[PDB]
Design a protein around this ligand. Structure first.
Ligand SMILES: Cc1ncc(COP(=O)(O)O)c(C/N=C2\CONC2=O)c1O
Ligand SMILES: Cc1ncc(COP(=O)(O)O)c(C/N=C2\CONC2=O)c1O
Lengths: 328, 325
């Protein structure tokens, strides 16, 4: 009921029913600790993900402005760009994607397979660039050129992580709260923390619906020092827009992404292997694999606030498995 | 009625979506709906999860500790079985063949085949699955001699028990379709036959006016019809029903063979992707959608009314089939 101001934002229906919240009995056995999973990897458009929730709000907003083109940015293998491109195609909007190679790879599958293949299936107009040094500004320049061609573009920022976009994860917290109700009394929630909309949206929602639960973001691209201010700003802007206050502290663990965004690491791949072999759940080498590696090491190192049930938010990413194989 | 008397595991939960496809409908000049069984929640999804609910229940009731099955290197059925084995703590042994003689690295190692590896699937390569039921049985015996307790899942999980999952799917469809329809037509890919046959039984009894058309993906009408019919009669027998409906099959859409992409198939993949953000695949749903399209093209359906396409999954093979062969 404190999140009722959410009702006032127009949104499209991309998801429908709440995504499953499942107990992981085999993984729990192995880690010695009750673990659950929020399956946002099973959202029903083009192989799923956390970005569909944000797109419900952002695309609603675009249509409301009479836009006919969605414009966004990410790595060649971004899930966000793939989701945005899938939603564009489904609604008959044009889509332009500004892409970069953040790891300097020349591997054929990174360059052409996985998410990148799907963009071509979606008739995505592709704009390569050297490095997204200033993505907000670089998106704007692109939007101007696109407009000059007569299109009516709507810029979706990196990962859809504006306060409006992040409303989808406030919404997700309501699902989670309901799903947990009488069930598992949760101590902790683990989510990947990248462009920050998921983390920030969950922070606001969980502070007001489950204020005793500890929320941990495992960084996938940045140190705590670089990432915290970004999650905080979004948290405050989301709160502002919902006429709430957000006093919770943001928690981040930055030990699990080295050597960099989009580079696999051993602990990441081990987590992917663990979850596949124990639960038939597919994680990914860029986001959820590193996040699950974080969760695991936090049990190892007694990093969590107590010994109680943990909820892992599965944010998607699996198509990247095929792009990352055999190596980058 | 009797469907309930069969033990089943919960792999799916809520009914899968049934969606109108307004952009595709607009382009074809015809109302089109899709049953999204590509969205089942385990390891990238598919039609086989429905069958596995019944078959794996049965395995557990016999105290098995190992699932054994067979398919192509890029089979979805094997990948779905392997995921289910992994999640239940069961070992899995997959008997694989290369049905198209390819040496392309992604066909051999990526897509579904990569996933088997992540699931710790024990892999048995063989030159050709000439007699899959027999070959599976021999395998089962050697596995048993190592002290395991194996349970054979036949190709495609298409035994009468396995096909109960698609009788079940017809219920979901029937209930979902009251808001909408009236359907004239349902289109599904017809391979090892469990999907086709189970839908045949369910739909005869729940929507007897709807025409069900299977687009073959591996065989001529002459070869496939007896297989679907046998399964239809066995399913009906086990539910103490009769099944008098004719089986309809279109075999024009799979040349030059099982597991080989064709132009119409890839054009169907491209069409659904660019119009609806839906992902089909080169082996199964792409060819099936090509058939639905050509049926409209050639006025092959019984009338001009709404069509339901059953999406049976397959998308991970897109990544195995790229760039070619
Ligand atoms: C599977 C997966 N998990 C997690 C995230 C991170 O959530 P976020 O913090 O982004 O809200 C992304 C999106 N990645 C977007 C953000 O980073 N670069 C991209 O194009 C993703 O695809
Ligand atoms: C996406 C997809 N569609 C359709 C089918 C065919 O369904 P059926 O008619 O067999 O129930 C399969 C079956 N996988 C079987 C079919 O052929 N060999 C296999 O491994 C499949 O993976």
């Amino acid at each position: 009921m404190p999140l009722h101001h959410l009702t006032r934002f127009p949104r499209l229906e991309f998801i429908g029913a709440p995504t499953p919240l499942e107990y992981l009995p085999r993984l729990s056995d192995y880690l010695g600790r009750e673990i659950y999973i929020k399956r946002d990897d099973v959202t029903p458009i083009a192989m799923g993900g956390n970005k569909l929730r944000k797109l419900e709000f952002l695309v609603a907003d675009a249509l409301r402005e009479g836009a006919d083109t969605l414009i966004t940015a990410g790595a060649i293998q971004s899930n966000h760009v793939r989701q945005t491109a899938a939603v564009a195609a489904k609604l008959g909007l044009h889509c332009v994607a500004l892409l970069e190679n953040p790891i300097g790879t020349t591997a054929e599958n990174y360059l052409t397979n996985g998410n990148r293949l799907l963009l071509d299936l979606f008739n995505t107009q592709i704009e390569m660039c050297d490095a997204l040094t200033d993505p907000d500004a670089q998106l704007q320049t692109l939007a101007t050129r696109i407009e000059a061609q007569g299109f009516r573009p709507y810029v979706i920022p990196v990962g859809g992580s504006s306060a409006l976009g992040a409303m989808g994860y406030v919404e997700s917290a309501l699902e989670i709260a309901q799903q947990c109700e009488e069930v598992v009394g949760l101590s902790s929630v683990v989510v990947a923390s990248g462009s920050a909309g998921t983390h920030a949206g969950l922070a606001v929602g969980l502070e007001h619906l489950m204020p005793d639960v500890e929320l941990i973001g495992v960084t996938v691209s940045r140190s705590v020092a670089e990432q915290k201010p970004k999650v905080i700003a979004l948290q405050q802007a989301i709160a502002g827009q919902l006429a709430l206050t957000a006093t919770a502290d943001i928690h981040l663990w930055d030990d699990y992404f080295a050597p960099g965004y989009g580079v696999p690491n051993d602990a990441g791949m081990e987590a992917v292997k663990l979850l596949a072999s124990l639960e038939g759940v597919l994680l990914d080498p860029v986001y959820t694999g590193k996040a699950m590696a974080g969760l695991i090491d936090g049990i190892s190192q007694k990093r969590f606030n107590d010994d109680g049930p943990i909820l892992f938010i599965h944010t998607g990413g699996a198509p990247a498995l095929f792009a990352y194989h055999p190596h980058v």
